[PDB]
Amino acid sequence: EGAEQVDMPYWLYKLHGLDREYRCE
Amino acid sequence: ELEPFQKNFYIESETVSSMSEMEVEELRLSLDNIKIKGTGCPKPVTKWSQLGLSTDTMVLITKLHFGSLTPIQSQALPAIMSGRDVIGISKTGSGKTISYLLPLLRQVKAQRPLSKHETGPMGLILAPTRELALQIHEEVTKFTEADTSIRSVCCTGGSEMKKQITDLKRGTEIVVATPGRFIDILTLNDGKLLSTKRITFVVMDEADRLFDLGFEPQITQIMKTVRPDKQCVLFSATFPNKLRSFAVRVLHSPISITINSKGMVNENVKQKFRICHSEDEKFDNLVQLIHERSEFFDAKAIIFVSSQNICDFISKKLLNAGIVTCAIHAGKPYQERLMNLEKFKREKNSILLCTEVLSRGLNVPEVSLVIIYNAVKTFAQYVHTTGRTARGSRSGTAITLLLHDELSGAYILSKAMRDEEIKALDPLQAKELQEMSAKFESGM
Amino acid sequence: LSKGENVPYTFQDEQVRSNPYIYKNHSGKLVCKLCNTMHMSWSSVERHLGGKKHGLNVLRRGISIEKXXXXXXXXXXXXXXXXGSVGLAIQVNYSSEVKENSVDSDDKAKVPPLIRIVSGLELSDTKQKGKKFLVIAYEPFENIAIELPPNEILFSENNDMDNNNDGVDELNKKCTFWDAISKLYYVQ
RNA sequence: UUACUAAGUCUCAUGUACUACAU
RNA sequence: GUGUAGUAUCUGUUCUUUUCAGUGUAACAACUGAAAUGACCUCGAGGCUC
Known part of the structure; x- marks a missing residue:
C-alpha cells in the first residue's frame, strides 16, 4: 500500500599456513 | 538390470x-x-x-x-x-x-x-x-x-x-x-x-x-x-x-x-525481380527480357505461369508478338506435351512456357533463364521453379515479375533472396519489396 | 606482434609509450620494471600483461602513488487510575496571550513543551539526591519538576501499534498532549 | 612516511635449450 | 634445411570431498580411512544448543 513508481591465490593461502588457524596467546 | 522410464511426453x-x-x-x-x-x-x-x-x-x-x-x-x-x-x-x-x-x-x-x-x-x-x-x-x-x-x-x-x-x-x-x-x-x-x-x-x-x-x-x-x-x-x-x-x-x-545453414535457393542462382503495376507492363517486361537475352548469345529459358488458362493466353500473346514458345501444361494431351518438350530440347535457344506446378518434375536439363511470370505464393514452389536454373558453377538467373498487389509473393522474395541480390537492384523497387513484405507480415 | 611500436632500452634515458613499463635492459631481453620479470618474446610479454601478476603490481604501484524569563507556571497534579494499575497525570497551564504578543517570528513557536526524566545525581548545589524528576520545559517559561519516588508507575507495554515518529523520544509521543489552542499541556 | 620479500602445486598452451638414435 | 625415441627449463593457467583420525613432516605439504540428517538464534563468524 503506497509503493508507487513514477512516470584468488588459492593454493597460496593454504601454503602460507592457513590450513590450520594459528593463534597468539 | 536397468529401471524402465518414460521419455515420450509429447501429445501432438x-x-x-x-x-x-x-x-x-x-x-x-x-x-x-x-x-x-x-x-x-x-x-x-x-x-x-x-x-x-x-x-x-x-x-x-x-x-x-x-x-x-x-x-x-x-x-x-x-x-x-x-x-x-x-x-x-x-x-x-x-x-x-x-x-x-x-x-x-x-x-x-x-x-x-x-x-x-x-x-x-x-x-x-x-x-x-x-x-x-x-x-x-x-x-x-x-x-x-x-x-x-x-x-x-x-x-x-x-x-x-x-x-x-x-x-x-x-x-x-x-x-x-x-x-x-x-x-x-x-x-x-x-x-x-x-x-x-x-x-x-x-x-x-x-x-x-x-x-x-x-x-x-x-x-x-x-x-x-x-x-x-x-x-x-x-x-x-x-x-x-x-x-x-x-x-x-x-x-x-x-x-x-x-x-x-545455407540458402533456400542455391547461392549460385542469381535471384532478381521487377515490380510491375499492370498485367500489360508485366507482359512488356517479359518481352524485353526475351529480346535482351539474345544480345548475350546452350542458352534456353522457361517462363513459369500459374494456370493453364494463363499459359494458353500468354502463349497466344507471345505468338502475336513474334515470339514462339514451347507451351506445356496438364490440360494438354500427353502426346503434344512430348512434342513441345522435344522441340524445346532440340531447338537452340528455345523457350519453354510452363505451369509452375509441373516445375519440380520437368524432364529437361538446367536452363540459363527462368522467368516467373506469376509470382509464386509458396516457398516450396519458388524453390522448384528457380531450381530449374540451379547448376553449381553454371547456375543462371531467375527473375520474378511481381505485381504491386502481390504481398505474399513479396514476402517470399524477401525471405529467399540474398541481401546482396536485393542491393544490386533499384533502391525503390527494393523499398517497395520490403514494404509489401512487411504489410503481408503484419497482415497476420 | 609488436604492432610496430619501438620500446627503448632502459639505459637510453627517456615520444610517449603505450605502456611505460615493459623495457629492454642492457641485454636483449624484455623486462617489466614493476614486476621485475624477464620475458623472452613479445608473446610472453603479452601473457605477462594479460596475467593477474602484472595487474596486482599495477594496483600496488597505484597504491604507492596515492601514498528565559524564568517564570514558574501553574501545575495541577492529580492521582489517576485506569485498567490495570495507577498512573499520574499533570495539567500545566500557560499564559493567556499576555506577553506572547511581542514574539511571533516562527522561531520554534511550533515546538510544543518537552518532558524528560532527570536523576537528582546532578544539581547546582549537589547536597542530597537519589530520586527522579519529571522535568517539563517551554522556551520562555521556567522549567518545572515533579519527584517520582516510585521506581515505576504507568510505565506501559506497547500501548500503540509501533508507529515510528520519534518526535523527541518514546516518552513524549507515548504519553503527552499539547492543547496549543488553549495552551494546556497534559502529561500521563 | 611505503619501514624493505614474493613465486609454488594442478591444468592446458606458448618460449627455449638438450640427450641417445637414423639418413 | 631432416626423422625417430626421450629430457630439461620458462611462462601462462588454476585450485581440487566442507570435516574428523592415523601415517608423515622441523611444521607444513603429501598420503591413508570414514562421512549427517533435521531444527533454531545474532552479526561467512559464533552454539557448556537439541
Whole structure:
C-alpha cells in the first residue's frame, strides 16, 4: 500500500599456513 | 538390470496433426529454412499452446520468453518432448535453452523421487564454460523456483569445490556442470557423493566448444557411466567433424535440426525481380527480357505461369508478338506435351512456357533463364521453379515479375533472396519489396 | 606482434609509450620494471600483461602513488487510575496571550513543551539526591519538576501499534498532549 | 612516511635449450 | 634445411570431498580411512544448543 513508481591465490593461502588457524596467546 | 522410464511426453495437438506433409515442408521453409535429417521427426509447432503445458508454466514462460517461438524452438521442442535424441544446430541467442529445459523438466518430474540413499541427478546439462553453466542454471531455477520437488546444482571450475559439495550432500534432481568439475566430483570419495545411476537425460550445450576447450575425454567418460538408452541432446552453433563423430558415438536414431545453414535457393542462382503495376507492363517486361537475352548469345529459358488458362493466353500473346514458345501444361494431351518438350530440347535457344506446378518434375536439363511470370505464393514452389536454373558453377538467373498487389509473393522474395541480390537492384523497387513484405507480415 | 611500436632500452634515458613499463635492459631481453620479470618474446610479454601478476603490481604501484524569563507556571497534579494499575497525570497551564504578543517570528513557536526524566545525581548545589524528576520545559517559561519516588508507575507495554515518529523520544509521543489552542499541556 | 620479500602445486598452451638414435 | 625415441627449463593457467583420525613432516605439504540428517538464534563468524 503506497509503493508507487513514477512516470584468488588459492593454493597460496593454504601454503602460507592457513590450513590450520594459528593463534597468539 | 536397468529401471524402465518414460521419455515420450509429447501429445501432438489436433491442429498440428491435421497438417499435411506439403504443409509441413512449407512451414519449415518459412521458419528460416529448417532442415531435418533422421526418421520419424514430429511436425514443428507454431504456438506455445500446442505443447500442452499447464497454465502456471504458460504464465511463467510469458514472463520467460517474449514473442513468437523461434525456428529452433518450433522444431526442437516437439522432437525432444517426444523423447528423441537430437542434434540441434543453431546460433547462440536462438532460444535453444528452453527447447531442452521444458522437456527435461517434464521428464525428471515424472520419475519417482530420489530415495533417502540416492544422490541424483536425473538430468545432466554439460557446458564448456563456467559462464554458460551459470546462465543455464539460472534458467533452470526460474522453473525450479515454483516447484520445490526439483533442485538444480551448478558445478563448475573456477569456483569453490567445498561449496558445491555442501549442495550435493542434500541430493539434487538436476546438475548443470562443466565436464572437468563433474568428472572430479564423480571420482571424489569413491564416487559416493554423486551417482550416475539415475541419469536418464543428458544435454550438451555449445557442444562444438567442448572439443575446442579440450573436454572430449571428460564428456566421453561421462557418457560411458550413463545408461545407453538415456535421452541425449547436443546443441551447437556449428557442426565440426569432431562433433559429427561424437554424435555417432553417443546418440541413437538422432534427429538433426539445422536452421538456415545455407540458402533456400542455391547461392549460385542469381535471384532478381521487377515490380510491375499492370498485367500489360508485366507482359512488356517479359518481352524485353526475351529480346535482351539474345544480345548475350546452350542458352534456353522457361517462363513459369500459374494456370493453364494463363499459359494458353500468354502463349497466344507471345505468338502475336513474334515470339514462339514451347507451351506445356496438364490440360494438354500427353502426346503434344512430348512434342513441345522435344522441340524445346532440340531447338537452340528455345523457350519453354510452363505451369509452375509441373516445375519440380520437368524432364529437361538446367536452363540459363527462368522467368516467373506469376509470382509464386509458396516457398516450396519458388524453390522448384528457380531450381530449374540451379547448376553449381553454371547456375543462371531467375527473375520474378511481381505485381504491386502481390504481398505474399513479396514476402517470399524477401525471405529467399540474398541481401546482396536485393542491393544490386533499384533502391525503390527494393523499398517497395520490403514494404509489401512487411504489410503481408503484419497482415497476420 | 609488436604492432610496430619501438620500446627503448632502459639505459637510453627517456615520444610517449603505450605502456611505460615493459623495457629492454642492457641485454636483449624484455623486462617489466614493476614486476621485475624477464620475458623472452613479445608473446610472453603479452601473457605477462594479460596475467593477474602484472595487474596486482599495477594496483600496488597505484597504491604507492596515492601514498528565559524564568517564570514558574501553574501545575495541577492529580492521582489517576485506569485498567490495570495507577498512573499520574499533570495539567500545566500557560499564559493567556499576555506577553506572547511581542514574539511571533516562527522561531520554534511550533515546538510544543518537552518532558524528560532527570536523576537528582546532578544539581547546582549537589547536597542530597537519589530520586527522579519529571522535568517539563517551554522556551520562555521556567522549567518545572515533579519527584517520582516510585521506581515505576504507568510505565506501559506497547500501548500503540509501533508507529515510528520519534518526535523527541518514546516518552513524549507515548504519553503527552499539547492543547496549543488553549495552551494546556497534559502529561500521563 | 611505503619501514624493505614474493613465486609454488594442478591444468592446458606458448618460449627455449638438450640427450641417445637414423639418413 | 631432416626423422625417430626421450629430457630439461620458462611462462601462462588454476585450485581440487566442507570435516574428523592415523601415517608423515622441523611444521607444513603429501598420503591413508570414514562421512549427517533435521531444527533454531545474532552479526561467512559464533552454539557448556537439541
